[PDB]
Structure formats: C-alpha cells, structure tokens
Scaffold this motif. Structure first.
Motif, short mmCIF file in Angstrom:
data_model
loop_
_atom_site.label_atom_id
_atom_site.label_comp_id
_atom_site.label_asym_id
_atom_site.label_seq_id
_atom_site.Cartn_x
_atom_site.Cartn_y
_atom_site.Cartn_z
N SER D 39 0.80 -1.17 -0.13
CA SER D 39 0.04 -0.04 0.06
C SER D 39 1.07 1.26 -0.05
N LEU D 40 0.54 2.48 -0.63
CA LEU D 40 1.01 3.49 -0.85
C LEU D 40 2.64 3.21 -1.20
N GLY D 41 3.45 4.01 -0.70
CA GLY D 41 4.79 3.80 -0.83
C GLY D 41 5.72 3.05 0.00
N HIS D 42 5.06 1.79 0.51
CA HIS D 42 5.62 0.97 1.47
C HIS D 42 5.03 -0.56 1.23
N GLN D 43 6.13 -1.42 1.21
CA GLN D 43 5.82 -2.90 0.99
C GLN D 43 6.34 -3.89 2.29
N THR D 44 5.48 -4.71 2.60
CA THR D 44 5.83 -5.64 3.42
C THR D 44 5.89 -7.15 2.99
N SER D 45 6.93 -7.97 3.49
CA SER D 45 6.95 -9.40 2.89
C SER D 45 7.99 -10.13 3.79
N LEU D 46 7.26 -10.80 4.79
CA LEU D 46 7.87 -11.48 5.85
C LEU D 46 7.14 -12.91 6.02
N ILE D 47 8.20 -13.55 6.50
CA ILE D 47 7.67 -15.44 6.58
C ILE D 47 7.77 -15.56 7.89
N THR D 48 6.79 -16.38 8.40
CA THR D 48 6.73 -16.85 9.96
C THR D 48 6.85 -18.30 9.87
N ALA D 49 7.36 -19.11 10.79
CA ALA D 49 7.42 -20.18 11.10
C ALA D 49 7.53 -20.72 12.70
N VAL D 50 6.83 -21.58 12.95
CA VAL D 50 6.31 -22.13 14.49
C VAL D 50 7.07 -23.47 14.54
N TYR D 51 8.11 -23.68 15.13
CA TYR D 51 8.70 -25.03 15.41
C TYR D 51 8.12 -25.61 16.79
N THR D 115 11.73 -10.60 5.72
CA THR D 115 12.53 -10.72 4.75
C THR D 115 12.97 -9.48 3.75
N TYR D 116 11.79 -8.97 3.26
CA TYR D 116 11.76 -7.63 2.32
C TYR D 116 10.81 -6.80 3.03
N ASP D 117 11.32 -5.78 3.92
CA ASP D 117 10.63 -4.34 4.33
C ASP D 117 11.03 -3.44 3.36
N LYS D 118 10.34 -2.82 2.58
CA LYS D 118 10.65 -1.65 1.56
C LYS D 118 9.80 -0.37 1.75
N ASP D 119 10.61 0.86 1.56
CA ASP D 119 9.87 2.07 1.57
C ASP D 119 10.18 2.62 0.38
N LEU D 120 9.21 3.51 -0.28
CA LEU D 120 9.27 4.06 -1.60
C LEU D 120 8.76 5.39 -1.31
N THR D 121 9.44 6.22 -1.30
CA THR D 121 9.20 7.76 -0.92
C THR D 121 10.14 8.45 -1.75
N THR G 62 13.43 4.21 -4.54
CA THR G 62 13.76 5.51 -3.84
C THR G 62 14.89 4.99 -2.90
N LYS G 63 14.80 4.03 -1.85
CA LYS G 63 15.62 3.74 -0.84
C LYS G 63 15.59 2.15 -0.93
#
Lengths: 257, 157, 222, 207, 207, 291, 299
Positions: D39-51, D115-121, G62-63
């Motif tokens: 959403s907007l200029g930020h993307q979130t992509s994380l993986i969760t594992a329960v051992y 894994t992939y936390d990205k901000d687009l501004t 951008t970043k």
C-alpha cells in the motif's frame, strides 16, 4: 519472583475484588518511599543513585560530547547495563530500545535546549547501571534519569570555527525529562506502581510516559508475567491511562523539589 | 517385610499385641516367644485347628506350643471377624447464544506466486530435454509401494 | 621423496608428522576415550576432527578442511568395535607450503596422510590403508603432474587432491576415498590423471608401509 | 562467515491496502505462513515459522512457554535492540491467546523473518500488524490451540491488537504520532483488525 | 445433536453448557446480558459430538496423514499405551531408549538425531515375564535395536517406565553387530538369527 | 502522594575483634565458631565480639545469618524435587533436605509421583530433626501441627530478630494466626480449625494416625472475610516496621504495635519510614521504661 | 532350512525406525522415498531482479541497496539470494576474484553459524575463484568527478552475498550455487563519482559467460538381497533429498558442469559403495544436460 500457587490464588482474589485490597494496604494512587542521591561523580556532568523500598538500586551517569548535529542523528544515547544479565540479553535490549524512545532527541526531549553553534551541539550519553532489581525497572530508571538530568551541568559556550568553552563557569542543563510509570491491571482494578508480588499474579501491565505535563508518545502494554495473561476491556485502557493524569503532577512536585 | 496382604492387618495386630503381652508377662523378648518367621507363617496358613499350630512345617517355640489352644482360638475369632466386615431456564440462556452470533482475493503480491508451488519432478530423455511427470504418475508409484510392503509373510534360504 | 616420523608426542595415544615439499603437518590421535554428551554414538565410534592453520585463528577456511578430512577417515576406521567412544584427531599445520588464500589442496593432502599415520601408532582398528597426493596441471603443457610446488600452483588451471584406499600388501585399490578438484577440466583429463594418480599413490603406501615398519617393529618383540 | 575485507565501505546513494495470505510450504516446522502487504509507498513481505510444540527435557512447568524471535532479513535492516522489543510485545499478546495450559512441560518457538521490508518515497510500527497476522496463521497450521483470532492495525504510529470481534484489547503499542489521538486511533485499528481477522479465515479454509 | 457448521475455526462458538474436550474451553462471553458459559473451538478442523471435541485437520488430511509431526506432538503417550522405541544406552540394571511412535494398527512419527525427544527406561525387573529378579540385559537388547515395549507408571521426571514381560513385546527389528551386519529375524523367544550371515545373537525376541 | 528523601554532594549518608588479630594465648580453651587455632594461640576469623561460655571460646560476628539447630520450628518453600528428597529453602547457607520418609503420606505402605502434592515453590512449615556434617538441616513433618501453609500471605524478616519462645505459633485478635520461624519466614494467615482448637486451650502399643491429603491441597479456603484480609495487611506492615527499627519480635510486641496502627486507621500510611520510627519508639519507651 | 515370517510396518514408520531399511525397500521397485525414479531431478522456478533496486528499469527504487536477487525453489526447498554492494580503495588465478556469501540455513535453531552454514560459504568462495567467473579487471571503477554535472571516461568494487535457505530437506550446497549463478547475472554496478555512488545510473556486470556452470549432486547406493546371492548390483541416484537418502547414502558425487563439455569442480567421495568408472562417466554426462537445461530455463 517465585511464589506458591496456594498464595497466588489468595493475592489474586484479594486484588480483583471491589474493595481492591492491596498487600501492603496502600491505596491504588499511593507510592512507596524512595531515596534519591544526586551529584556524586565528579568525572561526569550529571549523576544520580536511586534506592527503592524493596531493595532495587540503580545508578545513572551522564556524559557529554561535542558532535556535529548535521551528521549526528540521535543526540541522546542511553546505554543500559543490568548486573547479572548479559549485554545481549532479551530483557536488557528491550529497555535499551524503550528508553531510547522516551528520551529521543527531538521527540521526548527537544534538541534546541542542548545546541551550541549553528553547526555543533552537545550529545548526551545516559549510562544506566542496575545494581539490583526485583520488578520491572523502567519506571525506576525514569525517576533516576529525571533527578540526574535536572542536576546536570555542562560547560558554557564562548562565541565558522571550532567552539571554545570556559574554564570555570558551567551552565545548567535545562531539560524537561520525560517520566515513565508502570500500571498493572488485576481483573477489573488498576494498580499504579505494582510490587514484586502484585505484578506476579496480575493479568496485564501498562507503561505510560509523561512529559511536559501530558502523556507523551512512547507507551506500551507489556505483560508482567507469563502465567496469568488476560485481555482487558478498552474501558480499562483509558481508566488507568487517565488515572495517571491526576496524580503525576503530585509526582513531579515531589520529584522536581 | 514378608509381603502380607493389607486385608489381614487385623490378624497381625492381634498376634503382635499378644506377642508383646506374653513377652512382658514372662520377661522374654518378643522374638523368643514368636519370631517374625513364625508370625508370617501363622497369618498365611491360618491354623483353625489345635493341631495346625503345633504341627507346623517350619517349627514353633515353647510359648506357641503351651498356648496352642489359645492361639488356635484367636485365629478362629479373627477369621469370623475378617469375614464379618467384608459382608458388612435453558431456553432463556440458549437464545442469548444465537443472538450473539448475529454480530459477525489477490493471488500474489511479490513472493506469493513462487513459494506455494507444489512438487514438480522432471525426467531427462536420451537427447537431453526435460520431461515433467504428472501428479498421477507419482501416485501410481505410491500405492504400488505400500501394497508391496505388507505382502511379506514367508522367508526362505 | 617425502619424510615422516611416528610417535613424537608423549601425551596422546598416537602422533605423526608428515613432511612433503615444504608443507609440514603434525597430527595427534587419542582414543578410545570417554566422549561428551552430544558426541557419544550408540553403536559406533565418534570422531572429533579438528584442523588448525599455521597463521591466525581457525576461520571458515579450515572448517571445510575438517569436513573433507572427516569423509576420508570415517570409512577407514572400524567404528562399530568402539561403541560409545570418542577419538580426537587434531591436525596442526606448521608450514603451509603454498598460498593459503588462493589454494588449500596441499594441506588437505598432508592432513590425510598425517592423520592416517597417527591412527596407526595409536592402535585404532583400520579396515585398510590410505594415501593422498596433490595433482595440478600447468596451463603451458596441459599435462598432469603430481605434488606441484608453490610456484606451479599459481600457473595451474585446475587442482586435484586424490585420496585412495589400498589393501592386500598395498596393491589392490578397494575404493577411491576422496578426489577433490577445482578449476578447469574435462572428462578426457579426468581419467588421464585418475590413472596416473593411482600409480603415484601405490608407491606412496609402499613408502608409508616401509616407514611405519622401521619404527613399530623395533618397539615390539625387538 | 566471510564478511570480506574490513577496508571496504558500503554504498551511499545521493484508502486501499493490498494483502496476500499463504500458509504451509515448509517441511521443517509444523505450521508456517506468509503475509504480504503493498500500500502507498511501502511494501511488507515477511515469513513466519512455528517450530513446536517441543517437549522440554527436565521441565515441570504447569503451562507452555512461548518464544518469539524477529530476525533481520535482507532489506531495511533494523537495529537488534528494537527487534527484541517488538518480540517481547508479541509474547505479551500471544501469552493470552495461545492455550498455554494445554501444553505442560513444553515450549513453542516462533521464527519470523522480516525478509523484504521496503519503503518507496519509528518505521517498525507499520510492520507490527503484519507480524501478528502471520503468527496466528502459522500457529493454527501447527495444530496449536489459540483462543480466537488475533489481529492488529496501524493508525499513525499507534498499533492496537484486539480480540473477540474487537470487544477486548489484548495489546497496545504506540510510538511517535501525536497527542490526544486515542479513540480515533482505536477505531481506525478496530475496523482494520476485522479486515485482517476474516481474511485469515478465508485463507486457512481453502483446500 | 448436530446443528452446528461442519468446520470450525479458533474463536467460533459451539454450544452452551454439553461438556468441553480436546479443542474447546469454557469461555464466558457478554452480550449486554449475563455471562453465559459458551464452549468455544480453538482448532482448525471439524467438530465431533459424543462429549464435545474439535479434531484438527480435514477428513482428507486425516487419511493422507498431512499432520504427521502434528499428531504425535499433540497426543502424548498416556498410561498403558504400547509404543515403539530404539535402544540408545545400555546400563547394567536398565536400558535407556527413545520413544519413536505410539498407537491407539496406526502410529505417529516422532520429532526428527537432535535431543528434546521422548525417551524411556526399561528396568531389569520388567524385561521378562519369568525370573524378574535375575536377568541379563546385555543378552536382551543392544544399542540400535527397535523394541516394542508397553509403558507403565508415569514417573516422567526425564524418562518413561516400559516393560517387555510378554510374548508380543521385545526386539522387533535389529541388525548383527549393532548395525554392522545383516538384518536379523526373531526365531525363538530369546534367539535372533540373520539368514545371509548365518550368525546368531541372543535377544529378547517378540513373535 | 509520594515521600521522596533527597541528598546532594555525597554518595550516601565488650571486646570487639577483627579477623587476623590475637584474642588470647591461653591454650586451655575450646575453639568455637568464628575462630581458628594456630601455634598454641587463638585468633579470630570474623569481626565481632568475644564470647566466653564455660571453656568454649568463640567470636559472635556482627552480620550473622540463620544457624540451623536441632529442634527449630522454621518455615520454607520447596526449591527443587529430587530422587525421594525435596530441597527446601530455609534461608541458611545451604538448602535443607526433606527426605520422603520425613512427611506424612496419605497412601502409606501400598509411586514416584511426588510432585503431585508437593512441587517447587510450595510453602510449608516443619521442625529441624537433625543436622549434617556440613551443617545442612534435616526437616520432618511427622506432626499434625506441621503442614502446608495456605489462606494467608508470606513475608520475611531478618533471622537475628526472632526471639525463641515456647509456642512457635501464636493466635492473634481479629481471627488472625501468626507463625514465627527462627529462620525469619513468617506466615500471616486466618485462624484455621487446628490453630484455634489447640493453641488457645496395660495393653496399649500406640496406633498410626490416618491423615489424608486434606492438608496438602492447594485449594485455599473459599470465603475469607473482607474484614479479616484487611487485618492481615495491617499485620504485615507492623511486622516490617519493627524489623525496620531493629526490634525483637515477640507475641506481646506484635499486638502492641497493632493498637498503634488504629491511630492512623488506614493500612496504607504504614509503609512510610517516618511512621515506622515512631511506632517502634512507642514500644521501646512505653514498655521497657514502665514495667 | 529356515522359515520365519518377518514383521511388517506401515510406510510411515518404516522411514523412522530405520532409514536404511526404508531406502532399500524403495530401490527394489525402482523408486526412491522422494517418490522419484533413479535418474529423476526436481523442477526449478527462479525470479531474477525481483528484490533489487533495478527491478523496474523505468521506475527505480527510492531507498534500496540490493543489486540483484534470485528466488530459487527446487521441490519443497526455498533459496533467496540477495547481493549488496561495496567499494574499496586500492593503493593466473590471482587475476580473478570471488564472492563473500553469508549462508544462513533456517532449521528452527538459535546460536552462531552452523557447521553447515560455514561449509557452504567457503565452498562457494572456492568454486567461484577456481571456475574464473569474476576477473579482477571487471571490478575496477571508472570513477568520474561531478561539478550538477557528472562525467565519465584507484577504486575497485566489493560484492557481498546473503543466501537464506528455507524448508531444507537435503544437501543445499547445489541449490545455493545455482541460485547464486542466477543472481549474479542480474546485478548492476552503480556508477560512482568524486566517493559517492549514483542514484539511478548503473552498469551491467562483466561476468565471464564462458565459464559459467551449474551444480548437480549424485549418489552411489549399494543394494542388498534381503530386501527384494553371490555379489549384487548397484544403482545411481540423482539429486539426493529427504532425510532417508542423506543419512544412508555414504557415497556421493557433486560436480559443476559448464557448457562445451567443461567442468569447474568435482568432489568424489567413496565411503559407501565402490565408485566404478561406469558411474563416473554417467554422472558427468548426466550433469552436462542438467547445466544446459538450467542455463536455458528462463533466459
């Protein structure tokens, strides 16, 4: 702490009732007597030692360093070290990351009160040392850094060249230091400043930060014990949150004295 | 010590206390008038008759022989005593359950199209081209292995 | 011609020192001894392989050196006759004899030979014998040469470390233990060196047997 | 671990919220999940594992012990001090949702890989509501008992996690933001909690 | 007795007070009235009525056994259960083993080696059915043999108590020379022999 | 309101012997605790006062912990559960042991499920049966009077502030029963059926008592009086107040300080340090200077 | 002479009580415990330039700092290979460089780097340098000076790597290598001026495409007559996977195959069965086709 399940049910039933009977009998708005010593480390600008009623003792030292604020992001770095706990321990880095937010340069404390030239400014190093602890010390360290910052003296500026400071005179650090309080909820009653036995059988905990006569940003709701962890009604969130708005000025009047 | 059923506790109590009174009467040790070996033998055989106590296979003491009629009468008293004790507003709360129940697609963004991919096995031909196998081919080999696993009932040389 | 000495340490069950060209490796074997909790094996013998470089601490470069040496000695020792036991095999590289950053084949070849020798002096059950040699090819003539010197490695295209297993008086080759290669080679050159490496290791065990006999025989009935 | 030479310097350069839900695709642990939000200029992509659950040797605790750990992925590497701070807040929430009394003398290990936390501004406030929805899907896939679904939302730094259709609050987190923004921040996350709550059930029932 | 939906998710209410069971818990809810004891499911699966219990997984997931590592971790070996173990340590008066499966036939694979796995101890007094006082465990078991032993008293401070004082209990799978030989088969009650190697080794067979 | 004491400028606010000095050169003495013999001369190993009881020469140290002696009524919580023995935390230098044969088992002679009715952390009271070679104490619960504590709250006082008397436990007004342990572990609970019915008011070879698990159950009393629980909170403050003023704890001084708390008529004003010094002074002056 | 019926077990517990026995029973039917035949591999699916700053050639990030990425997946294993960038100021195999990988296999444990994580990180560095993929002349920087206005005609590039393996089921040394070769062809070196990098302008990496190779592991298993007899026959298994194969098979062959019949690295361990020259030639030819399909899978 470590108690028996026989007495845990006794303290749970006594703190969840409508009278809300406390163990030591204090009122939900009362506190325990605290001793605070200040100004005892000549090699540091500010210093403070706090002693609680249950035996928790914490020492805070304050150092200063001239750094270019145009290249230095945070000007208030807090270094917490708990005796008996590793520097990389889970319980140490949480308070280290939490105190850096209650004393963030610009948010919790305005950077204008420690600027020198238009290029350079003072960087405040807050070194925390917990000698002993029996409960969550984030509220005790806030009381220690409060008296330490209000008793801090930094060298006076003499005035683009490198700044020069006076030899004898030193200016006082006029900074409003935020305050952190701990609240524990037992069923349907709020408890301001819990004890080692109160926080062990409580349902959940609340951390509120107070700055400039108001509740500031960095607040939490971390659980005080892994045994009895219960969800709270939103009416309890605002009850204890607005409860500190009534008695925190009584804390500052007794602490800033 | 000698593995005696707890149901016969009333029997060893009468014999131990009688052993103590006789030991105090004649100023003897309790084992002199009746050792622990003979005590466990009297509660096991339970000699009802006057001969069963005196003609025991392991042997008796002098106090047991002289008091043979008394002890043979006590076991008969305890046998008939151990045998004597063995013989002697829903609909008002159900509607609240149903009224509370009334209070109640993108395939991928980045990695949602690569990770949930299921197994895909390939085979190489003679020239050198990939040959993907269907999910039914590996299923035929699965049941063919489980059926041939429980069919081993004889071993020869 | 290589040099080797057996039984040089006084506080281990078996010790050895393998010297080839300029590479010198001292090994120490101790076992069977009481293992730790995470080390003991229910049926067979446990191995604690540890190699150390000449300079600096033990980095990740020597970690793959332990894993390759581990695969050479594991099938060579009759592990099943030492249940719930441990054997410490420490290899200390005194001189590298090459470039540590660019190469690591001569040290693996000497650690294999030094470890086998120390396993013989310690009296551990060995199913056979072992011999390892380094092999490289000069980019000029593109021919296979064994035990290349330090200057011959910097001009080499591909390096090889062949470890074999010999039985029946050091003649019959039971199985190829290790053949680690890195560089540029094809299938035609693979068997071109594998056949040449089998006859250079055959004279190595024949030279090893002569060495391990000139020292064990005087200590026995003599 | 090579890290290369120490003489090298790093490079220096001078409404609607899409969601993706998955589960499984992991054979090491018992239950896993994968949440993605753009959403907007930020993307979130994380993986969760329960051992888990894993029986603890020599333990005699009356209920289970949850162990949540956030690990830095490959982009937007946060500081390790703040990673464990959110983990302690995550444990304070899930200690009231997961049926601890069902698994005595055993612990549950949680592994969330941002894994992939990205901000687009604090930039971690927007990632907390996405980590909670990824653990609940992974805990349910592992056959572990949870008392009702757990979700959260963002409202300018303020992160509030609700439960039981938003009737009772299980956790509260706030950084930066403003002042006196409380009831509006609660309702902005209350309607956002329900947006994440029913979406988790829709992904957990498909085949 | 079945008006409820087929599948159930963590948080879905089932029926009032009925009794709880595996996958439920008495949670008192409030809907502008008195607190009613509502049984709430806390697992992803179908609800079953007998006694109210919520079993995890779909009917296809139970037959295909998609929850292999999830079934053994949730179903602990209770009293009297018959299990399959592996010999790890041999003592003079006992034999430490490692629980690998458990039946109710059907079994369940344990945890995948590393520690934190269920282990037991077969006392010398419970090895055979006759002459329980004087036995030789070295003639009964060897490290690396699969032994079928029934559990006894649960003094699970660290291990379990097992027994083999029957005919169908004992070594069910072994190999000559502790895995260095050929696969042996149980012939007599205390004699195991491998066909190919022809060697014989004394065990505690089960036939 | 808060009472904060502040300072500024500084970090804070018979025969006495020190370790290493000569106390006597007379060999005709018995070396006791805090004393090491050397070269026919006696030296002190700790700092304190010299004690000369009979021929036993010993040094009484200043700060001394609890010394477990045979026949002491103590209170302690279970630290760990071992093989047929439970290490209990009494407060001494080591953990006191409690063998399985030292407690009343309901099953009797008829089972390694020891943690079922007594796990770690559970609080109880017992009596010291004997001592070990290293000084460790051995407790026993072979009496009905000794059992698992419940229906109250736990507190701790220094060990050197408990006076040894005949009856270890006392009954107090307000339906409250105090349990004073010489180790410093006090248990303030409501009066039960046992402490109320006993503390206040030839062919026989003895029999064995039949005691069930009714005293080992963690289930506390269901209905405790609200007027009684506020009395327990009023007792816990006055006990820690006398301990704050280094005053010996006895039954007469517990009820005496209880009447002084009624002057404030609130259980919250007792935690302050100023009110503790006053109530403590009201006992040393109005009792020792009047009798 | 002897006639005793064996004891049967379901296929679920057969692999748990004895991985060796379960492995031999599959090979009697021509199958493997991975539900695959002898010389069967696993399909792969990759995503290059997906997590990099240069993902969209028109709309740059951008970043962002990652130069290239590759999300490889073979069967049920997941490999993520990102590449960060650095720079160092400077004042036959020596003319080539390599990569600095940080292998982090997630198996559900905590602590320092596993022995597996440190063995893959060094074998990748040793294979890149010997295969001659990155010459040192390709790391030089054509550093200009801006005055803005930048111009282009000592500094050298330093390339890092971080590989995160998820849902591991076997030896992932071959998956990290193949994923790195894919992620190598997707990175772009940012331009640098006088040192500061450029925000948008980039340069494709000069990779020696002649010597590129891919990984493929094999195994030599020795059968037994007691699981469906003078001597016996051995079979070759391609691409080992599952706990059953990795534990029992004590003889493997892992090789790096390049086009034009060239090989870059070979490991020949013969602990288990005897490695005959027959299976040596078969593994080499079976890898040349494997490297041709991977290099021509998506590009």
């Amino acid at each position: 702490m470590s108690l028996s399940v026989a007495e845990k049910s006794y303290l749970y039933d006594s703190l969840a009732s409508t009278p809300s009977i406390r163990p030591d009998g204090r009122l939900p708005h009362q506190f325990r007597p605290i001793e605070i010593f200040t100004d005892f480390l000549p090699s540091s600008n500010g210093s403070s030692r706090i002693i609680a009623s249950d035996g928790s003792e914490c020492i805070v030292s304050i150092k200063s360093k001239v750094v270019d604020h145009h290249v230095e992001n945070e000007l208030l770095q807090v270094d917490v070290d708990i005796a008996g706990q590793r520097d990389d321990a889970l319980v140490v880095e949480t308070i280290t990351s939490l105190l850096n937010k209650v004393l963030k340069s610009g948010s919790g404390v305005d950077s204008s009160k420690l600027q020198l030239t238009k290029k350079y400014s003072f960087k405040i190093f807050v070194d925390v040392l917990v000698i002993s602890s029996h409960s969550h010390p984030v509220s005790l360290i806030s009381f220690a850094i409060y008296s330490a910052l209000n008793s801090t003296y930094l060298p006076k500026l003499i005035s683009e060249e490198l700044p020069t400071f006076h030899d004898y005179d030193m200016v006082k650090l006029d900074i409003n230091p935020p305050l952190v309080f701990i609240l524990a909820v037992v069923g349907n009653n709020m408890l301001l400043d819990p004890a080692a036995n109160e926080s062990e059988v409580a349902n959940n905990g609340l951390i509120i930060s107070w700055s400039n006569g108001k509740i500031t940003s960095p607040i939490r709701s971390v659980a005080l014990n892994d045994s009895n962890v219960k969800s709270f009604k939103p009416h309890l969130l605002k009850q204890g949150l607005a409860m500190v708005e009534k008695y925190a000025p009584d804390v500052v009047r007794s602490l800033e004295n | 010590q000698y593995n005696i059923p707890p149901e016969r506790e009333v029997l060893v109590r009468e014999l131990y206390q009688w052993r103590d009174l006789i030991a105090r009467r004649d100023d003897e040790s309790p084992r002199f008038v009746m050792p622990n070996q003979l005590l466990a033998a009297l509660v096991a055989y339970t000699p009802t008759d006057v001969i069963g106590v005196v003609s025991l296979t392991n042997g008796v003491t002098e106090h047991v022989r002289q008091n043979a009629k008394l002890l043979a009468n006590l076991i008969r008293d305890a046998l008939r005593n151990i045998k004597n004790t063995n013989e002697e507003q829903i609909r008002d709360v159900m509607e609240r359950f149903s009224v509370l129940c009334n209070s109640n697609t993108n395939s991928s963004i980045l990695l949602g199209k690569i990770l949930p991919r299921e197994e895909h096995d390939i085979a190489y031909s003679k020239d050198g081209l990939p040959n993907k196998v269907k999910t039914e081919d590996i299923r035929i080999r699965a049941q063919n292995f489980k059926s041939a696993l429980a069919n081993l009932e004889d071993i020869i040389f | 011609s290589v040099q080797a000495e057996i039984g040089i340490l006084d506080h281990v069950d078996g010790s050895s020192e393998f010297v080839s060209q300029d590479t010198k490796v001292i090994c120490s074997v101790t076992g069977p001894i009481e293992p730790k909790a995470r080390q003991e094996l229910p049926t067979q013998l446990a191995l604690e392989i540890i190699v150390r470089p000449a300079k600096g601490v033990a980095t990740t470069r020597e970690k793959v050196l332990e894993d390759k040496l581990r695969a050479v000695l594991t099938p060579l020792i009759t592990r099943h006759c030492y249940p719930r036991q441990l054997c410490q095999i420490t290899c200390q590289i005194l001189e590298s004899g090459e470039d540590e950053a660019e190469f690591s084949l001569r040290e693996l070849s000497c650690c294999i030979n030094a470890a086998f020798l120390a396993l013989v002096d310690a009296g551990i059950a060995l199913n056979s014998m072992c011999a390892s040699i380094p092999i490289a090819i000069i980019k000029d003539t593109s021919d296979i040469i064994v035990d290349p010197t330090a200057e011959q490695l910097k001009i080499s295209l591909s390096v090889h470390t062949l470890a074999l297993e010999f039985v029946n008086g050091g003649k019959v080759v039971k199985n190829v233990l290790l053949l680690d290669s890195n560089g540029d080679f094809n299938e035609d050159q693979l068997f071109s060196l594998l056949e040449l490496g089998e006859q250079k290791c055959q004279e190595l065990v024949t030279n090893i047997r002569r060495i391990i006999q000139d020292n064990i025989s005087p200590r026995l009935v003599v | 671990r090579l890290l290369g030479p120490a003489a090298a310097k790093p490079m220096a350069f001078s409404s609607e919220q899409e969601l993706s839900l998955h589960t499984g695709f992991i054979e090491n642990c018992n239950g896993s999940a994968l949440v993605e939000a753009r959403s907007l200029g930020h993307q979130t992509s994380l993986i969760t594992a329960v051992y888990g659950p894993r029986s603890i040797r020599g333990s005699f605790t009356s209920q289970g012990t949850i162990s949540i750990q956030l690990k830095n992925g490959l982009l937007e590497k946060y500081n390790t001090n703040e990673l464990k701070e959110v983990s302690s807040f995550l444990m304070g929430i899930f200690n009231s949702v997961v049926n601890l009394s069902r698994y005595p003398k055993s612990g549950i290990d949680i592994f969330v890989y941002l894994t992939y936390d990205k901000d687009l501004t604090s930039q971690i406030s927007s990632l907390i509501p996405h980590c909670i929805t990824s653990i609940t899907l992974a805990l349910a896939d592992a056959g572990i008992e949870l008392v009702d679904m757990a979700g959260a939302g963002e409202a300018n730094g303020t992160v509030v996690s609700f439960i039981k259709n938003g009737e009772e609050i299980v956790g509260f987190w706030k950084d930066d933001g403003d002042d006196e923004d409380l009831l509006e921040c609660l309702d902005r996350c209350k309607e956002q909690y329900n947006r994440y709550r029913d979406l988790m059930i829709s992904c957990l029932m498909n085949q | 007795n079945f008006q409820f939906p087929e599948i159930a998710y963590p948080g879905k209410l089932i029926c009032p007070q009925y009794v709880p069971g595996p996958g439920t818990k008495l949670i008192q809810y409030e809907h502008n009235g008195r607190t009613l004891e509502a049984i709430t499911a806390t697992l992803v699966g179908t609800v079953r009525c007998e006694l109210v219990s919520v079993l995890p997984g779909t009917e296809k997931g139970r037959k295909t056994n998609k929850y292999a590592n999830n079934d053994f971790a949730n179903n602990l070996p209770k009293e009297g259960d018959i299990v399959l173990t592996r010999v790890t340590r041999l003592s003079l008066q006992r034999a430490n083993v490692e629980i690998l499966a458990v039946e109710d036939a059907t079994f369940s694979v344990s945890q995948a080696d590393l520690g934190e796995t269920f282990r037991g101890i077969i006392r010398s007094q419970d090895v055979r059915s006759t002459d329980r006082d004087r036995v030789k465990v070295i003639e009964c078991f060897k490290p690396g043999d699969i032994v079928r032993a029934q559990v006894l008293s649960l003094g699970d401070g660290t291990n379990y108590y097992l027994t083999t004082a029957r005919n169908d209990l004992g070594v069910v799978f072994a190999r000559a020379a502790n895995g260095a030989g050929g696969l042996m088969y149980a012939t007599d009650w205390q004699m195991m022999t491998s066909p190919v190697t022809g060697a014989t080794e004394k065990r505690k067979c089960a036939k | 309101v808060i009472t904060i004491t502040k300072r500024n400028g500084a970090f804070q606010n018979s025969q006495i012997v020190t370790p290493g000095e000569l106390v006597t050169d007379d060999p005709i003495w018995m070396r006791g605790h805090g004393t090491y013999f050397l070269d026919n001369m006696t030296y002190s190993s700790v700092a304190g006062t010299v004690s000369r009881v009979n021929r036993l020469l010993s040094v009484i140290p200043l700060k001394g912990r609890y010394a477990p002696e045979t026949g002491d009524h103590v209170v302690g919580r279970i630290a760990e559960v071992g093989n047929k023995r439970w290490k209990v935390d009494i407060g001494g230098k080591q953990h006191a042991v409690l063998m399985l044969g030292s407690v009343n088992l309901p099953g009797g002679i008829l089972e390694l499920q020891m943690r079922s009715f007594l796990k770690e952390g559970d609080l109880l009271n017992a009596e010291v049966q004997s001592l070990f070679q290293d000084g460790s104490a051995s407790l026993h619960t072979r009496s009905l009077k000794y059992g698992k504590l419940r229906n109250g709250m736990f507190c701790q006082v220094p060990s050197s502030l408990i006076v040894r008397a005949k009856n270890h436990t006392h009954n107090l007004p307000g339906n409250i029963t105090v349990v004073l342990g010489v180790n410093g572990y006090i248990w303030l609970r409501k009066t039960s059926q046992m402490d109320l019915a006993r503390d206040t008011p030839p062919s026989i070879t003895r029999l064995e008592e039949e005691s069930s698990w009714q005293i080992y159950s963690d289930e506390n009393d269901p209905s405790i009086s609200n007027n009684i629980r506020q009395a327990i909170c009023r007792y816990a403050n006055v006990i820690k107040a006398l301990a704050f003023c280094e005053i010996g704890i006895t039954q007469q001084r517990i009820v005496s300080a209880y009447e002084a708390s009624m002057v404030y008529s609130n259980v919250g004003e007792l935690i302050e340090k100023n009110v503790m010094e006053s109530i403590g002074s009201d006992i040393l002056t109005a009792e020792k200077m009047r009798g | 002479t002897i006639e005793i019926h064996p004891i049967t077990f379901p296929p679920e517990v057969l692999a748990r009580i004895s991985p060796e026995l379960s492995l031999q029973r599959h090979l009697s039917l021509g199958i493997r415990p991975c539900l695959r035949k002898y010389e069967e591999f696993r399909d792969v699916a990759i995503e290059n330039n997906t997590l990099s700053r240069y993902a969209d050639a028109g709309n740059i990030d951008t970043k962002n700092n990652i130069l290239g990425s590759n999300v490889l997946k073979s069967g049920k294993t997941i490999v993520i290979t990102s590449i960060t960038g650095g720079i160092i100021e400077e004042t036959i195999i020596a003319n080539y460089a390599s990569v600095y990988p940080v292998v982090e296999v997630e198996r559900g444990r905590v602590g320092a780097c596993t022995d597996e994580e440190m063995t893959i990180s060094q074998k990748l560095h040793d294979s890149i340098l010997h295969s001659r993929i990155l010459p040192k002349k390709a790391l030089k920087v054509k550093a200009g000076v801006r005055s803005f206005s930048v111009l282009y005609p000592k500094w050298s590039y330093v390339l890092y790597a971080k590989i995160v393996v998820l849902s591991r089921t076997g030896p992932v040394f071959d998956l990290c290598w193949n994923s790195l070769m894919y992620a190598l062809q997707s990175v772009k070196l940012p331009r640098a001026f006088i040192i500061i990098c450029d925000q948008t302008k980039s340069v494709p990496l000069m990779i020696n495409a002649k010597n590129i190779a891919f990984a493929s592991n094999y195994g030599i298993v020795e059968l037994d007559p007691e699981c469906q007899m003078d001597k016996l026959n051995t079979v070759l298994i391609a691409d080992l996977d599952t706990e059953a194969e990795e534990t029992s098979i004590h003889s493997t062959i892992s090789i790096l195959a390049a086009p034009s019949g060239n090989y870059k690295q070979l490991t020949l361990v013969g602990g288990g069965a005897k490695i005959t020259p027959e299976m040596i030639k078969r593994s080499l030819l079976l890898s040349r086709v494997r490297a041709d399909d991977l290099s021509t899978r998506f590009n």
